[PDB]
Amino acid sequence: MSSTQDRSQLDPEVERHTGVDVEDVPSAEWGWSHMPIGVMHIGGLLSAAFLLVMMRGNHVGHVEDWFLIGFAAVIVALVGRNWWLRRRGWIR
Amino acid sequence: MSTALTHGLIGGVPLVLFAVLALIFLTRKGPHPDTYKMSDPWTHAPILWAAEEPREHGHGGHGHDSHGVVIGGGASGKW
Amino acid sequence: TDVVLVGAGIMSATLGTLIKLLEPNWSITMIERLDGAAAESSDPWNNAGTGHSALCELNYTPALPDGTIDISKAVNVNEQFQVSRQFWAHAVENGVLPDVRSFLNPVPHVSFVYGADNVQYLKARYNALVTNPLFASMEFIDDKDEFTRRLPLMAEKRDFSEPVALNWSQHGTDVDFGSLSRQLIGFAAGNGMTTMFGHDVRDLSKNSDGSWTVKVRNRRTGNNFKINAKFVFVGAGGGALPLLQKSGIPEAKGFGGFPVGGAFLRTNKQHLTSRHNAKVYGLPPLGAPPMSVPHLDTRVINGRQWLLFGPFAGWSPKFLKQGKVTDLPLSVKPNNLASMLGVGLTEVGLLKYLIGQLLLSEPARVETLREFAPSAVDSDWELDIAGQRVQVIRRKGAGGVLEFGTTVLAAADGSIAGLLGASPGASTAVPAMLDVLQRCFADRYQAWTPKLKEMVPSLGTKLSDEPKLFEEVWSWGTKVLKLDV
Amino acid sequence: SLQRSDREVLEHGVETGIIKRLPHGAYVELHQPLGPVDEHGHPIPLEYAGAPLP
Amino acid sequence: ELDLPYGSALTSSGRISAVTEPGELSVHYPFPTMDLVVLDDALKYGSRAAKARFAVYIGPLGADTAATAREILANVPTPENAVLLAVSPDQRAIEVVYGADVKGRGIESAAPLGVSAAAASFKEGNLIDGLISAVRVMSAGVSPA
Amino acid sequence: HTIPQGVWVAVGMGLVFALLIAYPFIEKKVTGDDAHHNLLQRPRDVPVRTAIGS
Ligand SMILES: CC(C)=CCC/C(C)=C/CC/C(C)=C/CC/C(C)=C/CC/C(C)=C\CC/C(C)=C/CC/C(C)=C/CC/C(C)=C/CC/C(C)=C/CC1=C(C)C(=O)c2ccccc2C1=O
Numbered sequence: 008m009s010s011t012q013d014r015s016q017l018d019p020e021v022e023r024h025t026g027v028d029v030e031d032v033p034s035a036e037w038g039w040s041h042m043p044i045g046v047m048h049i050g051g052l053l054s055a056a057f058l059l060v061m062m063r064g065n066h067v068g069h070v071e072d073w074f075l076i077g078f079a080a081v082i083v084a085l086v087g088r089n090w091w092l093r094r095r096g097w098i099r
Numbered sequence: 100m101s102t103a104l105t106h107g108l109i110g111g112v113p114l115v116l117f118a119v120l121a122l123i124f125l126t127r128k129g130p131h132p133d134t135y136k137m138s139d140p141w142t143h144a145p146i147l148w149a150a151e152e153p154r155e156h157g158h159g160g161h162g163h164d165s166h167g168v169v170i171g172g173g174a175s176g177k178w
Numbered sequence: 179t180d181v182v183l184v185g186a187g188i189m190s191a192t193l194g195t196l197i198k199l200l201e202p203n204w205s206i207t208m209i210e211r212l213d214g215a216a217a218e219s220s221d222p223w224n225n226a227g228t229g230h231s232a233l234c235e236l237n238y239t240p241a242l243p244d245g246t247i248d249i250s251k252a253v254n255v256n257e258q259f260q261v262s263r264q265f266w267a268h269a270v271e272n273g274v275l276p277d278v279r280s281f282l283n284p285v286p287h288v289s290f291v292y293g294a295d296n297v298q299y300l301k302a303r304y305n306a307l308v309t310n311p312l313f314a315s316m317e318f319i320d321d322k323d324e325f326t327r328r329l330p331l332m333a334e335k336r337d338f339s340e341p342v343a344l345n346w347s348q349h350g351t352d353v354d355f356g357s358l359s360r361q362l363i364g365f366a367a368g369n370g371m372t373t374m375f376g377h378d379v380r381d382l383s384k385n386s387d388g389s390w391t392v393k394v395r396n397r398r399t400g401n402n403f404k405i406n407a408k409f410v411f412v413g414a415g416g417g418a419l420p421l422l423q424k425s426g427i428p429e430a431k432g433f434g435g436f437p438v439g440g441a442f443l444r445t446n447k448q449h450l451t452s453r454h455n456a457k458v459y460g461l462p463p464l465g466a467p468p469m470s471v472p473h474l475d476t477r478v479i480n481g482r483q484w485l486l487f488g489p490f491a492g493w494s495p496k497f498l499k500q501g502k503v504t505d506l507p508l509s510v511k512p513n514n515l516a517s518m519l520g521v522g523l524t525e526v527g528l529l530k531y532l533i534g535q536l537l538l539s540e541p542a543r544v545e546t547l548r549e550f551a552p553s554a555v556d557s558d559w560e561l562d563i564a565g566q567r568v569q570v571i572r573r574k575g576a577g578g579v580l581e582f583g584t585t586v587l588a589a590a591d592g593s594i595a596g597l598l599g600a601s602p603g604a605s606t607a608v609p610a611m612l613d614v615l616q617r618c619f620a621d622r623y624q625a626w627t628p629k630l631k632e633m634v635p636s637l638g639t640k641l642s643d644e645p646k647l648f649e650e651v652w653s654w655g656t657k658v659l660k661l662d663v
Numbered sequence: 664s665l666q667r668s669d670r671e672v673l674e675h676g677v678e679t680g681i682i683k684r685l686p687h688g689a690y691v692e693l694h695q696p697l698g699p700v701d702e703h704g705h706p707i708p709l710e711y712a713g714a715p716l717p
Numbered sequence: 718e719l720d721l722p723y724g725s726a727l728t729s730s731g732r733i734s735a736v737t738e739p740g741e742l743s744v745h746y747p748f749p750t751m752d753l754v755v756l757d758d759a760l761k762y763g764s765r766a767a768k769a770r771f772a773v774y775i776g777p778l779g780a781d782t783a784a785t786a787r788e789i790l791a792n793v794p795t796p797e798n799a800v801l802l803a804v805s806p807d808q809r810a811i812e813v814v815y816g817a818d819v820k821g822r823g824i825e826s827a828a829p830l831g832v833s834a835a836a837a838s839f840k841e842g843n844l845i846d847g848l849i850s851a852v853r854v855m856s857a858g859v860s861p862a
Numbered sequence: 863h864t865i866p867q868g869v870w871v872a873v874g875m876g877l878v879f880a881l882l883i884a885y886p887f888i889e890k891k892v893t894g895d896d897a898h899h900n901l902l903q904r905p906r907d908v909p910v911r912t913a914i915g916s
């Protein structure tokens with residue numbers, strides 16, 4: 008009871024009509040809420056590529072290369088799953 | 100004994116058994132009703148589906164009242 | 179089926195209705211890749227809706243080297259719009275178009291200029307046009323108080339020490355081609371046209387009997403099937419070029435496509451929309467293509483007033499808004515490669531213009547709007563991505579040239595036609611579909627002529643040369659289309 | 664999810680101790696609305712205003 | 718009044734505590750789970766743009782099809798802004814109805830388009846695909862309030 | 863010639879500082895918001911920026 012409701016008029020300025028919606032991100036209008044999926048897909052692919060490329064180096068070790076392979080493989084698998092699901096409309 | 104034979108056995112017998120059991124079980128008719136054919140009569144009870152898409156005032160049922168059907172058009176078709 | 183219509187835009191909607199009125203017993207199948215009608219180039223957000231009567235379009239009235247104004251293009255485009263208007267009036271009276279105000283609205287058409295030389299040009303343009311019956315009601319306005327009264331948004335914070343002028347045409351229109359397409363398709367479907375939404379035409383192959391095998395894919399199920407058609411119309415927007423290339427017809431050989439996107443600034447803020455009630459076209463910037471004339475338009479979309487400013491030129495390798503990034507690369511063929519490479523060498527001015535428009539920030543787009551409305555504030559405007567258009571690349575000698583017109587491509591035997599290009603496009607859908615009917619059904623066209631003249635009383639007559647017939651069809655069409663209300 | 668928590672607090676009130684309803688064995692957390700309460704028990708949901716909620 | 722043929726009982730409150738035999742299901746919808754998921758995806762977020770509750774009624778709507786469509790729309794939770802597409806294959810009939818708030822938003826123009834898509838898909842022989850296509854077309858046509 | 867591994871870290875530091883200095887302009891170019899903002903926004907209310915900062 009000892010609390011007063013808040014009235015806020017923040018200055019707005021993309022108009023959010025495209026991208027994310029309040030049902031998905033409740034505070035979409037209040038700040039940057041949408042990162043294009045292409046950005047994250049390409050970022051994951053480049054992270055996997057960097058992990059694979061680190062195999063080429065001055066290390067006589069081999070478990071290091073195998074760890075890089077595994078992490079790059081799971082990253083690529085996640086990116087591929089996301090891309091495939093969004094291509095099919097989030098199915099399976 | 101026959102290192103290659105043992106490796107192949109441990110790697111294959113599980114696979115062969117999995118294939119056999121999948122053929123036995125995954126190839127059985129499921130409990131999901133078969134898809135309704137257009138030719139067949141519609142036997143299932145009426146199915147009304149709604150989006151639950153927008154916000155509905157408050158979740159509380161009371162206070163909603165019955166403002167009215169307030170129709171807003173129509174359409175028709177015959178396949 | 180007797181007829182296949184590929185795409186559910188204004189062209190296929192117009193042709194499907196015309197054929198259905200002429201030949202009620204013909205089987206027509208409309209095939210649309212999207213889940214609804216007019217959801218691409220005919221969508222009200224994907225085009226300017228101008229109801230293109232050549233009233234405001236300064237690029238149709240070039241100054242000649244002697245200082246006279248050539249009006250020939252303006253006259254021809256106005257006559258083509260009057261043909262479309264007559265068909266719409268007949269379609270309203272015959273219950274084909276039951277809701278006139280959802281697709282057609284009275285909105286003044288206005289040419290706007292600033293600076294002394296452009297005011298002199300606009301006065302010379304006025305003097306040339308008003309001699310023709312189709313433009314006789316045009317007004318010339320160079321008075322500040324009259325400018326301020328008619329365009330209060332464009333007058334606010336305007337420096338009038340630089341001279342301004344208008345050509346005002348009171349009897350312009352705004353056209354929702356999306357509503358118009360849906361009504362025409364609705365009529366044709368209610369009369370037994372089959373509609374196939376979510377279905378993509380994959381291939382076109384001519385049969386030994388002269389008919390067409392149309393290869394269709396359901397996009398929801400992935401299933402492929404075939405339809406046999408006596409006639410095929412390819413109204414698929416930018417998707418028409420790849421289908422006409424697949425049909426293997428000689429007439430489609432050597433055609434390339436250049437995809438041009440557009441964007442508009444838009445607003446529905448009542449304090450702006452209540453202060454601007456016209457379609458206002460400026461001069462094209464030096465070296466701008468004829469379709470990139472900046473304009474500030476009143477639009478009526480779903481019964482709501484909007485202002486749209488643009489088009490800003492965009493680029494995408496897609497041939498449709500819901501197209502593929504592979505559309506442009508896959509459109510390159512050994513027989514059109516020379517034409518496509520030639521355009522980069524022949525159209526350097528256009529390429530420079532397109533690059534400049536692509537580099538514009540959102541504030542820089544609102545800065546171009548301040549040339550029309552000096553009081554414009556950035557936060558009142560949002561960017562909307564318009565329709566994708568494919569400009570035709572035709573072979574010219576060793577190179578290619580861009581065609582900015584609407585090109586009706588028909589096979590020599592009339593068994594297939596398709597539409598390529600960009601403007602005036604939707605406003606001339608009726609005369610373009612009459613050209614399709616004449617070229618593709620020459621054996622029937624003479625028998626259809628009486629019924630075509632019932633739909634378009636001026637069919638085969640120049641309205642410029644017949645002022646009485648113009649006034650009759652104008653008065654009838656005004657009343658029936660409610661354009662006096 | 665913090666946004667979702669804020670919205671749930673806005674539309675249902677703050678959470679409190681559980682109460683067993685008189686006639687039947689329903690359990691209800693016995694929330695406390697942060698704004699005007701409808702004629703019945705459930706409150707009128709408030710709109711997020713960019714400020715922390717109790 | 719009578720509960721389900723077996724195992725369902727009215728509880729202390731209004732809710733009916735129902736049971737199903739161990740081997741069988743509850744929904745019993747005669748459609749694949751994946752196609753039901755696709756239709757739900759449509760109705761849920763492909764209609765979010767419309768901001769109008771999109772509803773589908775596969776049941777049989779007999780007698781005056783229009784009026785039965787009107788009252789099944791009335792049965793929708795928020796008929797004020799709702800668009801109900803009803804298909805009766807026992808009668809090979811489609812009927813679309815709209816709420817008063819859903820007016821002038823392109824819904825009326827989209828009505829023939831959605832019905833045509835549904836009819837085309839049905840004559841092809843896919844009830845669910847036609848329902849999805851109609852929902853997509855109508856949602857694209859309808860503009861948010 | 864030789865390009866030792868030190869240049870990699872030097873360029874990395876250069877990129878770190880350039881991005882840190884130019885973030886507000888990067889953020890405004892990306893999102894599009896040039897409105898005069900005097901009211902802060904809770905980090906939860908801006909998921910993408912709080913995610914990037916995290
Ligand atoms: C960092 C940020 C908000 C970035 C915004 C995005 C942006 C514009 C990035 C541009 C540049 C790039 C490429 C950045 C990525 C890497 C990076 C940040 C490089 C520059 C590094 C730099 C000069 C400054 C980063 C400073 C920063 C905000 C650090 C986190 C500090 C905060 C707020 C901590 C929470 C406050 C708090 C109660 C702390 C005490 C609790 C503890 C112990 C936290 C953990 C902890 C910390 C944080 C230590 O620093 C540390 C150092 C040495 C030994 C141990 C610790 C340790 O245990």
Ligand SMILES: CC(C)=CCC/C(C)=C/CC/C(C)=C/CC/C(C)=C/CC/C(C)=C\CC/C(C)=C/CC/C(C)=C/CC/C(C)=C/CC/C(C)=C/CC1=C(C)C(=O)c2ccccc2C1=O
Nearest residue numbers: 868871872873875876879880883884885886887888889891
């Ligand atoms: C994309 C987009 C929208 C962009 C927005 C546009 C934008 C950038 C707008 C902002 C405009 C800007 C930034 C304007 C300039 C502002 C400015 C400098 C104002 C003057 C400030 C003032 C009053 C006095 C000057 C203060 C000052 C020194 C400022 C610069 C601070 C910086 C960036 C220092 C970087 C130092 C540095 C590492 C330079 C590289 C040179 C190298 C490699 C030296 C070698 C080197 C040395 C010497 C080490 O000590 C060292 C120690 C540990 C690890 C490695 C190294 C190392 O590699």
Ligand SMILES: CCCCCCCCCCCCCCCC(=O)O[C@H](COC(=O)CCCCCCC[C@@H](C)CCCCCCCCC)COP(=O)(O)O[C@H]1[C@H](O)[C@H](O)[C@H](O)[C@@H](O)[C@@H]1O
Nearest residue numbers: 058061066067068069070071072073074075076077078079
């Ligand atoms: C900030 C920390 C969080 C990091 C997040 C990133 C998570 C990804 C971690 C990647 C792990 C990579 C591990 C592999 C690395 C690798 O390649 O090296 C190997 C060593 O393998 C290993 O143990 C692998 C151990 C992996 C466990 C990783 C645990 C993650 C922890 C750190 C997470 C907790 C974080 C706490 C957060 C605290 C918050 C603070 C606020 C071999 O060395 P070596 O020893 O020479 O082996 C020789 C033989 O090979 C050779 O035959 C034989 O002859 C011998 O010579 C033998 O020596």
Ligand SMILES: CCCCCCCC/C=C\CCCCCCCC(=O)OC[C@H](COP(=O)(O)OCCN)OC(=O)CCCCCCCCCCCCCCC
Nearest residue numbers: 066067068069070071072073074075076077078079080081
């Ligand atoms: C689930 C997987 C389950 C995998 C579990 C396997 C665990 C067994 C590992 C070690 C056992 C102790 C042996 C210790 C000695 C190593 C054996 C050997 O000698 O194998 C031959 C060469 C090196 O020859 P080197 O003479 O060692 O000398 C070298 C330079 N002088 O490596 C090879 O090709 C063969 C590769 C040998 C080990 C590599 C394992 C690393 C990580 C695997 C994937 C991580 C995935 C991360 C996912 C995010």
Ligand SMILES: CCCCCCCC/C=C\CCCCCCCC(=O)OC[C@H](COP(=O)(O)OCCN)OC(=O)CCCCCCCCCCCCCCC
Nearest residue numbers: 021022025026042043045046881885888891892893894914
């Ligand atoms: C530790 C972590 C590393 C440190 C992290 C700090 C560095 C800054 C962080 C992230 C930058 C990338 C952000 C994501 C950029 C988004 C890309 C896009 O696809 O553009 C979409 C936008 C929305 O437009 P919308 O009308 O809302 O339409 C919705 C469409 N779905 O468009 C635009 O206005 C903008 C287009 C061009 C943006 C260019 C931004 C980068 C400039 C160069 C600076 C270097 C960047 C370094 C990257 C690490």
